[PDB]
């Protein structure tokens, strides 16, 4: 499937931007490597393997979204990528993750992916957004608003 | 969620993210870059249904920037490859992602799912990013990398 | 045609990520600029020019893969992007290079690209992965590994 290879390709780019983020903001290495691990596992299942990837994974993202949000304050306006370099790469990560989300959904409608795959990616982009806001807040970088 | 529209919007989001990376790396151009990001968000917004009278004045604004920034540059006699100062390399990348976003919006031009001004702007923008990449290398004393 | 344009765009994105790597790890600038030079020559050929880009290019890449791999030990894990910043960007380069490969291979089937283009790009992604490990090895950054 040219569709399968596309999805895998979007996933590889995502894992790569994630590594960039990790390299720039080591403090989040532990959390980002776990997300990268999950992406590789998702990639392996789409490729034909079976890691028994379950919904527990998605709830795990939800939990992170919640715990990191406790540091943030209200999305007053719309945020434009900016601030700390790592924050800007988290935005890039969010965008690539969303592209990978569209690709996985495409395979999902043909039964070549699991709903948990598309769902995990759906929550992941949200978490990536929260992490960009977190980086700017910890490093005292104002977010850029529209 | 018409795959062609969400795709165009995805490319635009990536473009604004790369532009943010440039701004982080070269804060001396943040003011100019944020204005470009604001324009990308407006374009994106209109394509998503929220028209905001995005005017062709925007395009003129870019052509003007292209003109004033080139005044700093010598006549070019080589094909430039991405390189030099880190911000210059990312500007070249912004341009490449801008050209990809340009393609998705042009596709939306048919069926009139996007304005003709959106496509025009993106086109001039990719040219501006090229000029800015050269400007950054010139101001930081970084030779441009050239083909061959 | 839109196929050609998309292929050219992926090659252009690839060349830019390579430029980013060079700026971050200047000690590899000479070899990375040669790859950038070939990507541009390849793009030119797809756009209509002729640089007489030959299999000799491909062989040059395999030689680089071989020689750089000599600094490395046997690999017993799947490596995830990480470590030194330039290593993470080489992985990105590899990913975008694979995307460019897919587009060029699509042109191959319609005789809008040369077989040497596709093969060059296929070898290139392998070289990029090796360069990523070499960078981490030389800068004492452990590779990130699945699990």
Coordinates of C-alpha atoms in Angstrom, one line a residue:
Chain A
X1 CA 0.0 0.0 0.0
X2 CA 1.4 3.4 -1.0
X3 CA -1.0 4.5 1.7
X4 CA 0.8 2.3 4.3
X5 CA 4.2 3.6 3.3
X6 CA 3.0 7.1 3.5
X7 CA 1.6 6.7 7.0
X8 CA 4.9 5.0 8.1
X9 CA 6.8 7.9 6.5
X10 CA 4.8 10.5 8.3
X11 CA 5.4 8.6 11.5
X12 CA 9.1 8.5 10.9
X13 CA 9.3 12.3 10.3
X14 CA 7.3 12.8 13.5
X15 CA 9.6 10.6 15.6
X16 CA 12.5 12.6 14.1
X17 CA 11.2 16.1 15.0
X18 CA 10.5 14.6 18.4
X19 CA 14.1 13.6 18.7
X20 CA 15.0 17.2 17.8
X21 CA 12.8 18.5 20.6
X22 CA 14.4 16.1 23.0
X23 CA 17.9 17.1 22.0
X24 CA 17.0 20.8 22.5
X25 CA 15.1 20.4 25.7
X26 CA 16.7 17.4 27.6
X27 CA 14.5 18.1 30.7
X28 CA 11.6 16.5 28.7
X29 CA 13.8 13.6 27.3
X30 CA 12.2 10.9 29.5
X31 CA 8.6 11.9 28.5
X32 CA 9.5 12.4 24.8
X33 CA 11.3 9.1 24.5
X34 CA 8.2 7.3 25.8
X35 CA 6.1 9.0 23.1
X36 CA 8.8 8.0 20.5
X37 CA 8.7 4.5 21.8
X38 CA 4.9 4.4 21.3
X39 CA 5.2 5.8 17.8
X40 CA 7.7 3.1 16.8
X41 CA 5.3 0.4 18.3
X42 CA 2.4 1.9 16.4
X43 CA 4.6 2.0 13.3
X44 CA 5.5 -1.7 13.8
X45 CA 1.8 -2.7 14.1
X46 CA 0.9 -0.9 10.9
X47 CA 3.8 -2.7 9.4
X48 CA 2.3 -6.1 10.3
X49 CA 3.6 -6.7 13.9
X50 CA 1.5 -6.8 17.0
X51 CA 2.6 -5.2 20.2
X52 CA -0.9 -5.5 21.7
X53 CA -1.0 -1.7 21.7
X54 CA -4.1 -0.9 23.8
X55 CA -6.4 2.0 24.9
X56 CA -4.4 2.2 28.1
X57 CA -1.9 4.0 25.9
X58 CA -4.4 6.7 25.0
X59 CA -5.5 7.3 28.6
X60 CA -1.8 7.7 29.4
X61 CA -1.6 10.6 27.0
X62 CA -4.8 12.1 28.5
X63 CA -3.2 11.9 31.9
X64 CA -0.1 13.8 30.7
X65 CA -2.2 16.4 29.0
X66 CA -3.9 17.0 32.3
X67 CA -0.8 17.0 34.5
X68 CA 1.2 19.4 32.3
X69 CA -1.9 21.7 31.8
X70 CA -1.7 22.4 35.6
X71 CA 1.3 24.5 34.9
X72 CA -0.4 26.5 32.1
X73 CA -2.9 29.3 32.2
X74 CA -5.9 29.8 29.9
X75 CA -5.5 29.9 26.1
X76 CA -6.5 33.5 26.0
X77 CA -5.9 34.0 22.3
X78 CA -4.5 31.9 19.4
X79 CA -0.8 30.9 19.7
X80 CA 1.7 31.2 16.8
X81 CA 4.8 29.0 16.9
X82 CA 7.6 30.9 18.7
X83 CA 9.5 31.5 21.9
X84 CA 12.0 29.0 23.0
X85 CA 13.5 27.0 20.0
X86 CA 12.2 23.7 21.5
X87 CA 8.7 25.2 21.8
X88 CA 8.7 26.0 18.1
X89 CA 9.8 22.5 17.3
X90 CA 7.0 21.1 19.5
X91 CA 4.6 23.1 17.3
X92 CA 6.3 21.5 14.2
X93 CA 5.8 18.2 16.0
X94 CA 2.1 18.9 16.5
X95 CA 1.7 19.7 12.8
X96 CA 3.6 16.6 11.6
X97 CA 1.7 14.5 14.1
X98 CA -1.6 15.8 12.7
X99 CA -0.4 14.9 9.2
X100 CA 0.4 11.4 10.4
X101 CA -3.0 11.4 12.0
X102 CA -4.7 12.0 8.7
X103 CA -2.6 9.2 7.1
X104 CA -3.4 6.7 9.8
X105 CA -7.1 7.5 9.6
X106 CA -6.9 6.8 5.8
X107 CA -5.6 3.3 6.6
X108 CA -8.2 2.9 9.4
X109 CA -11.1 3.2 6.9
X110 CA -9.6 0.2 5.0
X111 CA -8.9 -1.7 8.1
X112 CA -5.1 -1.4 7.8
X113 CA -4.7 0.4 11.2
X114 CA -6.3 0.3 14.6
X115 CA -8.6 2.9 16.0
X116 CA -6.3 3.1 19.0
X117 CA -3.5 4.2 16.5
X118 CA -5.5 7.1 15.1
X119 CA -6.9 7.9 18.6
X120 CA -3.4 7.9 20.2
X121 CA -2.1 10.2 17.5
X122 CA -5.2 12.5 18.0
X123 CA -4.4 12.9 21.7
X124 CA -0.7 13.2 21.0
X125 CA -1.0 16.3 18.9
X126 CA -2.9 18.0 21.8
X127 CA -0.2 17.0 24.3
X128 CA 2.5 18.4 22.0
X129 CA 0.7 21.7 22.0
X130 CA 0.6 21.7 25.8
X131 CA 4.3 20.9 25.9
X132 CA 5.2 23.8 23.7
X133 CA 3.4 26.1 26.1
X134 CA 5.1 24.4 29.0
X135 CA 8.6 25.0 27.5
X136 CA 7.9 28.7 27.0
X137 CA 6.5 29.0 30.5
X138 CA 9.5 27.3 32.2
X139 CA 12.0 29.3 30.2
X140 CA 10.1 32.6 30.5
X141 CA 9.4 33.0 26.8
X142 CA 6.2 34.8 26.0
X143 CA 4.0 33.0 23.5
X144 CA 3.3 34.8 20.3
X145 CA -0.4 35.6 19.9
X146 CA -2.3 36.2 16.7
Chain B
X1 CA -12.6 18.0 6.7
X2 CA -12.3 17.7 2.9
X3 CA -8.9 16.0 2.6
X4 CA -7.6 18.6 0.1
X5 CA -8.5 21.5 2.5
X6 CA -7.1 19.8 5.7
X7 CA -3.9 19.0 3.7
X8 CA -3.5 22.6 2.6
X9 CA -4.1 23.7 6.2
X10 CA -1.5 21.1 7.5
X11 CA 1.2 22.5 5.2
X12 CA 0.4 26.0 6.4
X13 CA 0.7 25.0 10.0
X14 CA 4.1 23.4 9.3
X15 CA 5.2 26.6 7.5
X16 CA 4.2 28.7 10.5
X17 CA 6.1 26.3 12.8
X18 CA 9.3 26.5 10.8
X19 CA 9.0 30.3 10.7
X20 CA 8.8 30.2 14.5
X21 CA 12.0 28.2 14.5
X22 CA 13.7 30.9 12.4
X23 CA 12.4 33.6 14.7
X24 CA 13.9 31.7 17.7
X25 CA 17.2 31.4 16.0
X26 CA 17.4 35.0 14.6
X27 CA 15.4 37.3 16.9
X28 CA 16.4 40.3 14.9
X29 CA 13.8 39.3 12.3
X30 CA 11.0 38.3 14.8
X31 CA 9.0 41.4 14.0
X32 CA 9.0 40.7 10.3
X33 CA 8.5 37.0 10.8
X34 CA 5.6 37.4 13.2
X35 CA 3.8 39.6 10.7
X36 CA 4.3 36.8 8.1
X37 CA 3.0 34.3 10.6
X38 CA -0.1 36.5 11.2
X39 CA -0.7 36.6 7.5
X40 CA -0.4 32.8 7.3
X41 CA -2.9 32.4 10.1
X42 CA -5.3 34.7 8.3
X43 CA -4.9 32.8 5.0
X44 CA -5.4 29.5 6.9
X45 CA -8.4 30.9 8.7
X46 CA -10.1 32.1 5.5
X47 CA -9.5 28.7 3.8
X48 CA -11.2 27.2 6.9
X49 CA -14.3 29.2 6.2
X50 CA -13.6 32.3 8.3
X51 CA -13.1 35.0 5.6
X52 CA -11.3 38.2 6.9
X53 CA -11.0 40.4 3.8
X54 CA -7.4 39.3 3.2
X55 CA -6.4 41.9 0.6
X56 CA -4.0 41.9 -2.3
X57 CA -2.4 44.7 -0.4
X58 CA -0.8 41.8 1.5
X59 CA 1.0 40.6 -1.6
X60 CA 2.2 44.1 -2.4
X61 CA 3.5 44.1 1.2
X62 CA 5.7 41.1 0.5
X63 CA 7.0 42.4 -2.9
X64 CA 8.0 45.5 -1.1
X65 CA 9.9 43.5 1.5
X66 CA 11.5 41.5 -1.3
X67 CA 12.7 44.8 -2.9
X68 CA 14.1 46.5 0.2
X69 CA 15.9 43.4 1.5
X70 CA 17.5 42.6 -1.9
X71 CA 19.1 46.1 -1.8
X72 CA 21.6 44.6 0.7
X73 CA 22.6 41.8 -1.7
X74 CA 25.0 41.7 -4.6
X75 CA 24.0 40.3 -8.0
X76 CA 24.0 36.6 -7.6
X77 CA 25.9 34.4 -10.1
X78 CA 25.5 30.9 -8.7
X79 CA 22.7 28.6 -7.6
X80 CA 22.6 28.7 -3.8
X81 CA 22.3 25.6 -1.7
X82 CA 20.8 25.7 1.8
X83 CA 23.6 26.4 4.3
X84 CA 25.7 28.8 6.3
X85 CA 24.2 30.3 9.4
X86 CA 21.7 28.0 11.1
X87 CA 18.8 30.5 10.6
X88 CA 19.7 30.8 6.9
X89 CA 19.4 27.0 6.5
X90 CA 16.0 27.0 8.2
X91 CA 14.8 30.0 6.1
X92 CA 15.6 27.8 3.0
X93 CA 13.5 25.1 4.7
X94 CA 10.7 27.5 5.3
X95 CA 10.8 28.4 1.6
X96 CA 10.6 24.7 0.7
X97 CA 7.6 24.1 3.0
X98 CA 6.1 27.4 1.8
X99 CA 6.4 26.1 -1.8
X100 CA 4.7 22.8 -0.7
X101 CA 1.9 24.8 1.0
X102 CA 1.7 26.9 -2.1
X103 CA 0.9 23.7 -4.1
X104 CA -1.9 22.7 -1.8
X105 CA -3.6 26.1 -2.0
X106 CA -3.2 26.2 -5.8
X107 CA -5.1 22.9 -5.9
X108 CA -7.8 24.5 -3.8
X109 CA -7.8 27.3 -6.4
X110 CA -9.9 25.0 -8.6
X111 CA -13.4 24.4 -7.2
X112 CA -12.7 27.8 -5.6
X113 CA -11.9 26.4 -2.2
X114 CA -9.3 29.1 -1.7
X115 CA -8.8 32.7 -2.9
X116 CA -6.5 33.7 -5.7
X117 CA -4.8 36.1 -3.3
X118 CA -3.8 33.2 -1.0
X119 CA -1.8 31.5 -3.8
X120 CA -0.3 34.8 -4.9
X121 CA 0.9 35.6 -1.4
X122 CA 2.5 32.2 -0.8
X123 CA 4.3 32.5 -4.1
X124 CA 5.9 35.9 -3.2
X125 CA 6.6 34.6 0.3
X126 CA 8.8 31.7 -0.8
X127 CA 10.8 34.3 -2.7
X128 CA 11.1 36.6 0.3
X129 CA 12.3 33.6 2.5
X130 CA 15.1 33.0 -0.1
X131 CA 16.1 36.7 0.1
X132 CA 16.1 36.6 3.9
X133 CA 18.2 33.4 4.0
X134 CA 20.8 35.3 1.9
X135 CA 20.5 38.4 4.1
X136 CA 21.1 36.4 7.2
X137 CA 24.3 34.8 5.8
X138 CA 25.5 38.2 4.6
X139 CA 24.9 40.0 7.9
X140 CA 26.6 37.2 9.9
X141 CA 29.5 36.9 7.5
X142 CA 28.6 33.3 6.5
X143 CA 29.5 32.5 2.8
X144 CA 26.6 31.0 0.9
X145 CA 26.9 27.3 -0.1
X146 CA 26.9 27.1 -3.9
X147 CA 26.3 24.3 -6.3
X148 CA 29.6 22.9 -7.5
Chain C
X1 CA 3.9 17.0 -13.9
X2 CA 2.4 17.7 -10.5
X3 CA 4.3 14.4 -9.8
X4 CA 7.5 16.1 -11.0
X5 CA 6.8 19.2 -8.9
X6 CA 6.1 17.2 -5.8
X7 CA 9.3 15.2 -6.4
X8 CA 11.2 18.4 -6.8
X9 CA 9.7 19.9 -3.7
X10 CA 10.7 16.8 -1.6
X11 CA 14.2 17.0 -2.9
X12 CA 14.3 20.7 -2.0
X13 CA 13.1 20.0 1.5
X14 CA 15.7 17.3 1.8
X15 CA 18.5 19.7 0.7
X16 CA 17.4 22.2 3.3
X17 CA 17.4 19.7 6.2
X18 CA 20.9 18.7 5.0
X19 CA 21.8 22.4 5.1
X20 CA 20.6 22.5 8.7
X21 CA 22.8 19.5 9.5
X22 CA 25.9 21.0 8.0
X23 CA 25.4 24.2 10.0
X24 CA 25.1 22.1 13.2
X25 CA 28.0 19.8 12.5
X26 CA 30.5 21.7 10.3
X27 CA 33.0 18.9 10.7
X28 CA 30.8 17.0 8.1
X29 CA 30.2 20.0 5.9
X30 CA 32.5 18.8 3.1
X31 CA 30.8 15.5 2.7
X32 CA 27.2 16.8 3.3
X33 CA 27.7 19.6 0.7
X34 CA 28.7 16.9 -1.9
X35 CA 25.4 15.1 -1.2
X36 CA 23.7 18.5 -1.5
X37 CA 25.4 19.0 -4.8
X38 CA 24.2 15.7 -6.1
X39 CA 20.6 16.3 -4.9
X40 CA 20.6 19.5 -6.9
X41 CA 22.1 17.8 -9.9
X42 CA 19.4 15.1 -9.6
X43 CA 16.7 17.7 -9.3
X44 CA 18.1 19.4 -12.4
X45 CA 17.9 16.2 -14.4
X46 CA 14.3 15.7 -13.3
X47 CA 13.6 19.3 -14.4
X48 CA 15.0 18.6 -17.9
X49 CA 18.8 19.2 -17.7
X50 CA 21.4 16.5 -18.1
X51 CA 24.5 16.3 -15.9
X52 CA 25.3 12.8 -17.1
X53 CA 24.5 11.7 -13.5
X54 CA 25.8 8.1 -13.5
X55 CA 25.9 4.9 -11.4
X56 CA 29.4 6.0 -10.4
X57 CA 27.6 8.4 -8.0
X58 CA 25.7 5.5 -6.4
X59 CA 29.0 3.6 -6.0
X60 CA 30.4 6.7 -4.3
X61 CA 27.6 6.6 -1.7
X62 CA 28.1 2.9 -1.0
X63 CA 31.8 3.6 -0.4
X64 CA 30.8 6.2 2.1
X65 CA 28.4 3.9 3.8
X66 CA 31.1 1.3 4.1
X67 CA 33.8 3.6 5.3
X68 CA 31.7 5.4 7.9
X69 CA 30.3 2.1 9.2
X70 CA 33.8 1.1 10.1
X71 CA 33.6 3.5 13.1
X72 CA 30.5 1.7 14.3
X73 CA 30.0 -1.5 16.2
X74 CA 27.4 -4.1 15.4
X75 CA 23.9 -2.8 16.1
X76 CA 21.6 -4.8 18.3
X77 CA 18.6 -2.5 18.8
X78 CA 16.2 -0.3 16.7
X79 CA 17.5 3.2 17.0
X80 CA 15.0 6.1 17.5
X81 CA 16.0 9.7 16.6
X82 CA 17.9 11.3 19.4
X83 CA 21.1 12.3 21.0
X84 CA 23.2 15.1 19.5
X85 CA 21.1 17.7 17.8
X86 CA 22.8 17.1 14.4
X87 CA 22.2 13.3 14.8
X88 CA 18.4 14.0 15.3
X89 CA 18.4 16.2 12.2
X90 CA 20.2 13.5 10.2
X91 CA 17.4 11.1 11.1
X92 CA 15.0 13.8 9.9
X93 CA 17.0 14.0 6.7
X94 CA 16.7 10.3 6.3
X95 CA 12.9 10.5 6.7
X96 CA 12.5 13.3 4.2
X97 CA 15.0 11.5 1.9
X98 CA 12.7 8.4 2.0
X99 CA 9.8 10.7 1.2
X100 CA 11.8 12.1 -1.8
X101 CA 12.6 8.6 -2.8
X102 CA 8.9 7.6 -2.9
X103 CA 8.2 10.6 -5.2
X104 CA 11.1 9.9 -7.5
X105 CA 10.3 6.2 -7.8
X106 CA 6.7 7.3 -8.7
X107 CA 8.3 9.3 -11.6
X108 CA 10.5 6.3 -12.6
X109 CA 7.5 4.2 -13.5
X110 CA 6.5 6.9 -16.0
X111 CA 10.0 7.4 -17.3
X112 CA 10.1 10.8 -15.8
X113 CA 13.2 10.0 -13.7
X114 CA 16.3 7.8 -14.1
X115 CA 16.8 4.6 -12.2
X116 CA 20.1 6.0 -10.9
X117 CA 18.1 8.8 -9.2
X118 CA 16.0 6.4 -7.2
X119 CA 19.0 4.2 -6.4
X120 CA 21.1 7.2 -5.3
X121 CA 18.3 8.4 -3.0
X122 CA 17.9 4.9 -1.6
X123 CA 21.6 4.6 -0.8
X124 CA 21.5 8.2 0.6
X125 CA 19.0 7.4 3.3
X126 CA 21.1 4.5 4.5
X127 CA 24.2 6.8 4.6
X128 CA 22.2 9.4 6.6
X129 CA 21.3 6.9 9.2
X130 CA 25.0 5.9 9.5
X131 CA 26.1 9.5 9.8
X132 CA 23.6 10.0 12.6
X133 CA 25.2 7.2 14.6
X134 CA 28.7 8.3 13.8
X135 CA 27.9 11.8 15.1
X136 CA 26.5 10.4 18.4
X137 CA 29.5 8.1 18.6
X138 CA 32.0 10.9 18.0
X139 CA 30.3 13.3 20.5
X140 CA 29.7 10.7 23.2
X141 CA 25.9 10.8 22.9
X142 CA 24.2 7.4 23.5
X143 CA 21.7 6.5 20.8
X144 CA 18.1 6.4 21.8
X145 CA 16.7 2.9 21.4
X146 CA 13.2 1.4 21.2
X147 CA 12.4 0.0 24.7

